[PDB]
């Protein structure tokens, strides 16, 4: 069992290596297939666009201390290292919203207390490295065993819902920035960005997003549909998302006068704010000595960041590596955590962001590599992630190509990923059953062995938990969301059995 406490220290790490690394040649060789190239192309945008957006947001929140270039270099390097040495190479490491919230909060704290923000991050990274060495030594990751389908699916459904809602929020922001008006001030300055309302930008962006989503879904149906020869049908379907990107990008390109926001990458491989910092951060201090009390007091934020990264990455790995996804090469819970957090700490030493495996993107990477016969198999390899990381790193040199990619096309892609991520989740299935008559419920054990109203009460409790988590996320106490998620684990083990019989829980909540 991958989750078992062995007497020997660092047992999880060594068994993880001994279980996965023998498959290295197979991992290298299994990437020789068109589906792998299509997944590479899809995940490249799926990971670069969030990277660019979060880098820009980080640059705005901080005094340009950490910006787009830093995040892009961190993502490229960490992705390459994880793909080459990761136990589960299908995971894709990247920045996340909670990490952005933590870095703005730590920035505010450091500014209030007068410390150096980047040096504080360096010390947080040192603390993270120490904590993870300690945890992996004692095989702490085994606690992830207690995370059942209940918590896994609540987390995954919530994350997908936030993804979709945020994409729609970006569309709404595009509309607000350029409201539909009778008259628009022409010859508006656009040097920093459009400084005022513009004509046809909002509606054209909406059309591009809708078209991209429609074409992606239609090509997916074509992949699952019966028309055309099987080989050509599947080849076209695997490249469905890339084909949609190409079609909508060309459609935008041929429109020569309307303005659609384009994906912009940093000018070159340089620190975003050269005056503020260099490439390497001196732990003692860039301009002033770092207080000793902070050297010792970074343990609390370091533990908070460790909890954030641990819960997200481990729950993402659990979701990705479920038995129903037909993963044979196995998965790693100790080596992956060690790699992710240690690389994050080393990056902090270099003034670069720390990343975590991200759920919508990891699930999308796994799905793009899934071969449907039911799921016949999954093309597990280390080349797709490595190529995605290399492309993310080289994006700075791919400015001419990337300047022609609208942001609305990527919004449509994000909607596609958010919609398709909801498919293999029992919580979503039961939510859908909330509207179907009991006559139409499928043939699943939790339907026959559990009365309709009892399972609907289960789904209602899960929906209440989802609402509570969303309220917490909206509240300025957002960084406490993971801990609230931990409160779900007792709920299944303590409170729910007081209301639900053992057989009903076993049928509804099963591995």
Ligand X SMILES: CCCCCCCC(=O)OC[C@H](COP(=O)(O)O[C@@H]1[C@H](O)[C@H](O)[C@@H](OP(=O)(O)O)[C@H](OP(=O)(O)O)[C@H]1O)OC(=O)CCCCCCC
Ligand Y SMILES: CCCCCCCCCCCC(=O)OC[C@H](COP(=O)(O)OCC[N+](C)(C)C)OC(=O)CCCCCCCCCCC
- What residue ranges bind a copy of itself (CB under 8 A)? 179-184, 186-187, 199-200, 202-204, 206-207, 210, 226-230, 255, 257-258, 432, 435-437, 440
Stretch that binds ligand Y, among 184-192, 237-245, 347-355, 397-405 (CB under 6 A): 347-355
Give whichever of 18 and 182 is closer to ligand Y, judged by the CB atom: 182
Torsion of CA 444, 447, 448, 449, to 10 degrees: 110
Using CB under 6 A, which of 114, 229, 268, 476 touches ligand X? Answer: 229
371 beta partners? 377
Phi, psi of 300 (to 5 degrees): -65, -55
H-type alpha helices, 140-194: 149-177
Q: Is 210 in the site for ligand Y (CB under 6 A)?
A: yes
What is residue 356's DSSP assignment?
A: E
CA distance 429 to 443: 12
CA angle 272, 273, 278 (to 5 degrees): 95
Closest-CA residue to 509 (of 499, 73, 496): 496
CA 428 – CA 443 distance, rounded (Å):
16
What, of a copy of itself, ligand X, ligand Y, none, does residue 350 touch, CB below 5 to 8 Å by kind?
Answer: ligand Y
Query: Residue 435, interface with ligand X (CB under 6 A)?
Result: yes
Task: In whole angstroms, give the CA distance from residue 241 to residue 247.
Answer: 10
Q: At what angle do helices 383-394 and 34-61 cross, to 10 degrees?
A: 40
- Closest to ligand X by CB, 430 vs 473, is 430
Q: Which of 275, 374, 376, 502 binds ligand NAG (CB under 6 A)?
A: 275
Query: Backbone dihedral region of 326: left (phi > 0), alpha (psi from -120 to 50 degrees) or beta?
Result: left
Binding residues among 235-274 for ligand NAG as defined by CB under 6 A: 273
| Among 176, 185, 224, 475, contact with ligand Y (rule: CB under 6 A) | 176
Q: Name which of ligand Y, a copy of itself, ligand NAG, none residue 182 binds, using a CB cut-off of 5 to 8 Å depending on partner kind.
A: a copy of itself
The minimum distance between CB 175 and ligand Y, in angstroms, equals 4
Contact, 271 vs 278, CB < 8 A? yes
Q: Which stretch binds ligand X (CB under 6 A): 203-211, 330-338, 435-443, 484-492?
A: 435-443
DSSP string, 93-143: EE--HHHHHHHHHHHHHHHHHT--HHHHHHHHHHHHHHHHHHHHHTTGGGG
Contact set for ligand NAG, span 56-75 (CB under 6 A): 63-64
Among 186, 192, 439, 494, binds ligand X (CB under 6 A): 439
Closest contact distance (angstroms) between CB of 258 and a copy of itself is 5
Q: Does 18 bind ligand X (CB under 6 A)?
A: no
Site of interaction with ligand Y (CB under 6 A): 73-74, 76-78, 171-172, 175-176, 179-181, 202, 206-207, 209-211, 251, 255, 257, 269, 278-280, 346-347, 350, 352, 390, 393-394
């Amino acid at each position: 069992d991958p989750l078992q406490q062995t007497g020997q220290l660092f047992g999880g790490l060594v068994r993880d290596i001994r279980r996965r690394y023998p498959y290295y040649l197979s991992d290298i060789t299994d990437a020789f297939s068109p589906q792998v190239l299509a997944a590479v192309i899809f995940i490249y945008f799926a990971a670069l666009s969030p990277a660019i957006t979060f880098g820009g947001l980080l640059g705005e929140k901080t005094r340009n201390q950490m910006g787009v270039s830093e995040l892009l270099i961190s993502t490229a390097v960490q992705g390459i290292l994880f793909a080459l040495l990761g136990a589960q190479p299908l995971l894709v490491v990247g920045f996340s919203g909670p990490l952005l919230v933590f870095e703005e909060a730590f920035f505010s704290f450091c500014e209030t207390n007068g410390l150096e923000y980047i040096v504080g991050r360096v010390w947080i990274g040192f603390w993270l490295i120490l904590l993870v060495v300690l945890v992996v030594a004692f095989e702490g990751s085994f606690l992830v065993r207690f995370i059942s389908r209940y918590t896994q699916e609540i987390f995954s459904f919530l994350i997908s819902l936030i993804f979709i809602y945020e994409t729609f929020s970006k569309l709404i922001k595009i509309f607000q920035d350029h409201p539909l008006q009778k008259t628009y001030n022409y010859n508006v300055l656009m040097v920093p960005k459009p400084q005022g309302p513009l004509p046809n930008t909002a509606l054209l962006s909406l059309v591009l997003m809708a078209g991209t989503f429609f074409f992606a879904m239609m090509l997916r149906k074509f992949k699952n549909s019966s028309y055309f020869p099987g080989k050509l049908r599947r080849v076209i379907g695997d490249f469905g998302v890339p084909i949609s990107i190409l079609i909508m990008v060309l459609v935008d390109f041929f429109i020569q006068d309307t303005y659609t926001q384009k994906l912009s990458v940093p000018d070159g491989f340089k620190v975003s704010n050269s005056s503020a910092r260099g490439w390497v951060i001196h732990p003692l201090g860039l301009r002033s000595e770092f207080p000793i009390w902070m050297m010792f007091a970074s343990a609390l934020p370091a533990l908070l960041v460790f909890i954030l990264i641990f819960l997200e990455s481990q729950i993402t790995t659990l979701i990705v590596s479920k038995p129903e996804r037909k993963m044979v090469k196995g998965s790693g819970f100790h080596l992956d955590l060690l790699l992710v957090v240690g690389m994050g700490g080393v990056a902090a030493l270099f003034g670069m962001p720390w990343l975590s495996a991200t759920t919508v993107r990891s699930v999308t990477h796994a799905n793009a590599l899934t071969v449907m016969g039911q799921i016949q198999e999954v093309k597990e390899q280390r080349i797709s992630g490595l190529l995605v990381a290399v492309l993310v790193g080289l994006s700075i040199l791919m400015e001419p190509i990337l300047s022609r990619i609208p942001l609305a096309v990527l919004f449509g892609i994000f909607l596609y990923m958010g919609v398709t991520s909801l498919s293999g989740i029992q919580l979503f299935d039961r939510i859908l059953l909330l509207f179907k008559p009991p006559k139409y419920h499928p043939d699943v054990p939790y339907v026959k062995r559990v009365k309709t109203w009892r399972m609907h009460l289960f789904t209602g409790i899960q929906i209440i938990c989802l609402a509570v988590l969303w309220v917490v996320k909206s509240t300025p106490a957002s960084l406490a969301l993971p801990f609230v998620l931990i409160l779900t684990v007792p709920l299944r083990r303590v409170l729910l059995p007081l209301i639900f019989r053992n057989v009903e829980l076993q049928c509804l909540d099963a591995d």
